Write a protein that binds this ligand. Sequence first.
Ligand code: BWD
Ligand code: BWD
Lengths: 260, 260
Amino acid sequence: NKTVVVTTILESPYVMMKKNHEALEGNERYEGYCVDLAAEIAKHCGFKYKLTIVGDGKYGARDADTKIWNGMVGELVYGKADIAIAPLTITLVREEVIDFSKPFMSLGISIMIKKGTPIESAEDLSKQTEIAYGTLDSGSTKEFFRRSKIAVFDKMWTYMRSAEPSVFVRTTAEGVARVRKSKGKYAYLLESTMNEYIEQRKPCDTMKVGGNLDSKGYGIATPKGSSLGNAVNLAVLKLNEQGLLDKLKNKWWYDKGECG
Amino acid sequence: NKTVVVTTILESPYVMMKKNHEALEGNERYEGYCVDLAAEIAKHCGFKYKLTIVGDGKYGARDADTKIWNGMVGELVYGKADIAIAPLTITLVREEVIDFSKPFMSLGISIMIKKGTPIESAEDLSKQTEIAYGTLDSGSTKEFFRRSKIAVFDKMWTYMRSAEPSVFVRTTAEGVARVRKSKGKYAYLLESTMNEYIEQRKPCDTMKVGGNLDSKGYGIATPKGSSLGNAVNLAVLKLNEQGLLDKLKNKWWYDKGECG
Ligand SMILES: N[C@@H](Cn1cc(Br)c(=O)[nH]c1=O)C(=O)O
Ligand SMILES: N[C@@H](Cn1cc(Br)c(=O)[nH]c1=O)C(=O)O
């Protein structure tokens, strides 16, 4: 009937501007895991779509005062977009206002260190102060620590929320740059699949250490009651069962890995 | 309003008969990961329930001729039970007839060998014939191979469906017993979390080898349109975010591990 508005976010390798995007237009301007996923979802659900980058560049959180939802979640809640296809974490608070398909990717919070840093776990981080550590300034990773009642994670949150200077960063790129330029005095807490991706990128000076702190997944989101919800959910299950999601990860993570 | 009928299956350590069940009655007769999960789900959703073991002892498949659904899926489809709480895999074909909550456990098909067996991957298995291998005779693991278009898995299915004697087993216990009693001439393909569980059970003679063949999850199921669906889904997300699901796995898998 009508072209579906897809909201997504510039997060490598999910969505990236093609080198020669200027010579291109529309959906052809972008490339990445979620760009490929969107094409597959649309084909299996039978709809035409337009890729758009979330206006405020955020994932989705609710302001405690205004009660307004920002980010991709907000665009769905307010009808500015019809579906969100990005590394958007399935969480309780979001599930209450929008619908999520079954997960297309499984992950967990993990630790990124510059090679050589004497840290092997969250426990290690929480028991020392020489090495600073933080998370993305907004998102499920930060919220995980803020709301955690688990001893170690609660101790980590207490340190992070009051640390000076700030240990929180605006983007993944900033967190990675901080790890790489801090001579081992900064460790970054981020979602495991991103940690895995960066570990295979030059200058190959970072690595994931320890096990994941939690377990969760990314899901495709639609406004509550959307007529696209059901088909999208089944499409995700079909793509996973056919092994296409596994193929996409290899395509964007390892096939072109730069660290051997 | 009315007591919720919960259908589940006798699969250790999800649901097991307590040693002194005779002296007990009702829900108290059972113990296990899913027994604990059911209590948590009911508490968070505010309902009273009765645990029942699926009549035909199956998970859920559709007969191609009669079109009738068997197992736990069947009990939901036909209204014999109101909710299924067990290690039930979220699959496309099932999602089409019943509703699934977001996953409460992530897993994948894996290889179980008796210690010392010269096999490290699915590739290894597919390229030889001395060592037989099979799966549970019904369920998502068998279906995975039957429907797989991936070269290695397709080759494995071709061998398994025609192997003599049969390499398929009726229950997990039978598969494990066959691995343990075949002197390394039988390898068992099963869901990873079960493989992990058995590896920590006496006589400690089995082990998981290689990476998982796929990625998926178990979900709580309800009849399509059930008024319990929404609350149950949010309950699962809440329990995971609070770290309770992680605690339950440790309780039933490692806290009482028998292999050191
Ligand atoms: N997926 C998160 C966003 N997000 C992303 C990355 Br990458 C990370 O390391 N941490 C996060 O919270 C959300 O949905 O808020
Ligand atoms: N979870 C499956 C059943 N199931 C269980 C175990 Br344990 C296994 O090794 N393989 C399966 O197919 C389903 O839902 O069919």
